[PDB]
Symmetry: C4
């Protein structure tokens, strides 16, 4: 069981990195939206 | 036991990231709605 | 320990629901983007 | 033991959702970039 819980920890850390990559993309999308809005106005 | 505490820690980290992700997604929605109103018409 | 692992399961399910709410918002944003692009073109 | 299998199951579910989330985020980025090019100029 000990070995399965270690695998789980590794996988959660992996998912965090994936969510991090999402967050960077969201930050990009927001700035691009803001720039698009500025253009319009 | 120590493994489980690690699992808990990663989960707490995941929650914080998901909340930040949610905040940014809302930012995007607000901007998009604002852009759509501008264009139409 | 058994009780801590049950708490963890509940929390993961909770996070899933949160991620689900994000996914609905993403689906909305995409359709709104598509509609905005159509207008422009 | 059965608790841990439940944890694993939820984690597998989380991965699938994160991947779907990523796919939609990319869709948004592509559309946004396309919209920005259109506007400018
Ligand atoms: Ca988004």
């Amino acid at each position: 069981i000990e070995k399965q819980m270690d695998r789980v920890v590794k996988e959660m850390r992996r998912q965090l990195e994936m969510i991090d990559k999402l967050t960077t993309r969201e930050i990009e999308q927001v700035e691009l939206l803001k720039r698009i809005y500025d253009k319009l106005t």
